[PDB]
């Protein structure tokens, strides 16, 4: 009852770019002639409530300020620290992989922008290995987290595997290679193989998937999402990572030297039209947390412009350092 509400705001919040946001403000919610700022202000958290012309704010304690962390919306803002959430199950060091909750809470949590003053340039080797990347995760999707969306539409995973497979991409393709792409023929075939009910609402979809997957940009966001290295964008994230790892490494000897420990869960592509692109891919590695088998989600977003060839030069032109967002969360069993 309360609880959709109070969901509902929360997602109403969106991080602050602004160049006329308060102090300290990283985030804020504009909801029918009320506004409200979240800021940050040597680590502590703050909450502005702007009613046309009242402002008052609330300090909050650490834990309050967790808990307003847990419910806001899977986007990137800037709280300059990486978090822990916890998610509803008590953990284990007698497991190889996160609990579905730990997951789903993965899937769902915000995470914190790493600043990228000091971006690498664009380098000759950039997404060299981006055709072999997306055929070994879809190749292991079946029994993978890995889901793809575009505009909040789940994209089967078969009809995913369909796709790259017809574009080509295999185990031997040459990494130089750009995608020479499907004819209308060609994805309406796979399209209405993977696409049997005729509601209006798949015959909806299965005319958008047309459209896309023939659009050589898109082709270009979704395979791009896969690439290994999409998110090392500075020293910055270097260190960030570097310093997450050793935690991970710490707390596995220490907790579960001898549990076996699943490295990775897949990648959650989300994509969106903006014709030109909004690409969201986050890869789920796993962290040993003192409670656990974690993960430590790290998302990158960029935008793909419409033009953009399926090939690495492509993408390393259209998708450099400086263009991508990169962010983190430890997501920890309770």
Not at 72 to 89: D, E, S
């Amino acid at each position: 009852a309360e609880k959709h509400s109070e969901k509902k705001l929360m997602d109403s919040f969106s991080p602050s770019l602004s160049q006329d946001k308060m102090d300290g403000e990283f985030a804020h919610a504009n909801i029918d002639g009320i506004s409200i700022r979240l800021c940050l202000n040597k680590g502590i958290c703050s909450v502005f409530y702007l009613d046309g012309d009242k402002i008052q704010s609330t300090q909050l304690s650490s834990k309050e300020y967790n808990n307003l962390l847990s419910s806001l919306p899977p986007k990137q803002f800037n709280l300059g620290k990486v978090h822990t959430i916890t998610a509803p199950v008590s953990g284990n060091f007698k497991t190889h992989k996160p609990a579905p909750e730990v997951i789903e809470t993965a899937i769902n949590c915000c995470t914190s922008i790493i600043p990228n003053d000091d971006y690498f340039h664009v380098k000759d080797t950039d997404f060299n290995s981006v055709w072999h990347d997306i055929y070994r995760d879809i190749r292991a999707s079946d029994s993978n987290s890995t889901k793809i969306y575009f505009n909040n539409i789940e994209i089967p995973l078969k009809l995913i595997a369909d796709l790259i497979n017809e574009l080509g991409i295999n185990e031997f393709i040459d990494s130089k290679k750009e995608l020479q792409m499907l004819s209308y023929n060609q994805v309406n075939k796979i399209i209405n193989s993977n696409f049997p009910q005729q509601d209006l609402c798949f015959q909806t979809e299965k005319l958008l998937f047309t459209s896309l997957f023939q659009d050589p940009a898109f082709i270009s966001a979704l395979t791009s999402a896969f690439w290994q290295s999409l998110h090392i964008t500075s020293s910055s994230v270097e260190h960030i990572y570097a310093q997450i790892m050793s935690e991970n490494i710490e707390n596995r000897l220490n907790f579960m030297p001898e549990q076996r420990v699943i490295n990775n869960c897949g990648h959650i592509i989300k994509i969106n039209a903006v014709r030109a692109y909004e690409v969201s891919s986050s890869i789920l590695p796993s962290h040993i947390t003192c409670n656990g088998v974690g993960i430590n989600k790290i998302e990158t977003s960029y935008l793909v412009h419409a033009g953009t060839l399926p090939s690495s030069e492509g993408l390393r032109n259209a998708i450099p350092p400086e263009s991508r967002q990169v962010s983190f969360a430890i997501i920890s069993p309770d």
